[PDB]
Amino acid sequence: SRIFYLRNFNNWMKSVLIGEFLEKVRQKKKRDITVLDLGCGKGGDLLKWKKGRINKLVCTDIADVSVKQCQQRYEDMKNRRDSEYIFSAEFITADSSKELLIDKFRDPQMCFDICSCQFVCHYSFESYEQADMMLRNACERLSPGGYFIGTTPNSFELIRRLEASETESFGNEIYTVKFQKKGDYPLFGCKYDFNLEGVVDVPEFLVYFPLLNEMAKKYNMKLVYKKTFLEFYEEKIKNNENKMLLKRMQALEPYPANESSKLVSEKVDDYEHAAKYMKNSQVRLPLGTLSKSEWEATSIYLVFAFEKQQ
Amino acid sequence: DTAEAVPKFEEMFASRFTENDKEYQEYLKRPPESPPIVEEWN
Ligand SMILES: Nc1ncnc2c1ncn2[C@@H]1O[C@H](CSCC[C@H](N)C(=O)O)[C@@H](O)[C@H]1O
């Protein structure tokens, strides 16, 4: 609830990211779209893929309870008898950093047009073999022209804040990051603690993107683009369909508040940027924005997309 | 397998997050980010 809009914004990011590359794939394929949702969680993206009209989805995760729960949502969606088409689906419990997915698929010859890895990649960089294995499961069975898309913390921003901090910790009322040590950052196994009041409290690993870029070349992948969350937003909101969606998903908080409602943050200067903004020649009100606290926590992330060469 | 790739990467990215890391140094020049603002939210 304190994090209500933080969630919606992140969901909007995935919607637009997924949306963009669904349109690209369909521009090339003109047939049944197959997608791998790697580290699917409890199925937060099930609805997104349903809206995207894909034909088959494969949901996989290390947490067996999550996967089945993901399966349960999907069953509930398909079992709600209406007119909407839904993808056929497949659910696999598996460590995608130590296990080969191709041996687990129903179809041994399975290929994908898109692998979607949202907020998962950095767990694989515990070691080289695990990182290579996840990259392999994500990219090797991609159809030529297919994509590897996802979201993961920006190590540049992480190290920036770490080294600027007085200690080995940094964060606020909403998130916390704790490195064991600064100055030393191994290519693999660079461990930090991550706590996001409302979503995670789970050790993560530093992902040096030039490294991920290099490792991905192993499976004939070229970089499509890599963007900070602000950059991706600044591009995507330039499209009114994306902007209307931003509102419908309530991905920003209305500002200023109604006399009868409340801002989400009680923190004293959490909305200074918004206040300063409407101190210029008049703004059309109300504003949509995010608390400074929430933005600090989510601006840490970047978006990436790789393409499978021909 | 691992024996070749890791030391290979260790050399390729030894400047990692240092003064010789041109990408990172460029990233440090970036102004602190302000949160998205949208007008006419209604
Ligand atoms: N090695 C691994 N293999 C498969 N899944 C993993 C994994 N390491 C972490 N995960 C999963 O990554 C997920 C991080 S949470 C993000 C959930 C989902 N991607 C979404 O955006 O809605 C967790 O569900 C976790 O079980």
Author numbering:
A (entry chain A): 167 to 476
B (entry chain C): 3 to 44
Please give me the paper's original passages concerning this structure.
The cap intermediate is methylated by the RNA guanine N-7 methyltransferase, utilising the methyl donor, AdoMet, to create the mature cap, m7GpppN, and byproduct, AdoHcy (S-adenosyl homocysteine). Human RNMT is a 476 amino acid nuclear protein consisting of a catalytic domain (residues 121–476), with homology to other eukaryotic cap methyltransferases and an N-terminal regulatory domain (residues 1–120), that mediates recruitment to transcription initiation sites. RNMT also has an activating subunit, RAM (RNMT-activating miniprotein).
In the RNMT–RAM crystal structure, RAM 2–45 binds to a positively charged surface groove on RNMT, distal to the active site. The interface between RNMT and RAM was analysed using the PISA server (EMBLI-EBI) revealing an average interface area of 1695 Å2. Eleven amino acids in RAM spanning R18 to W43 are involved in polar interactions with RNMT, and RAM E25, R32 and E42 establish salt bridges with RNMT K392, E397 and R450. Many residues involved in these interactions lie in the RNMT lobe (residues 416–456), which co-evolved with RAM in vertebrates. The most overt effect of RAM binding is the stabilisation and resolution of the RNMT lobe, residues 416–456. Secondary structure element attribution using the DSSP program revealed the lobe to consist of a β-sheet made of two small anti-parallel β-strands (10a and 10b), which flank the α-helix L. The RNMT–RAM crystal structure in conjunction with biochemical analyses and molecular dynamics simulations has revealed that RAM activates RNMT by stabilising the RNMT lobe and α-helix hinge, thus positioning adjacent helix A in the active site in a position favourable for substrate binding and the methylation reaction.
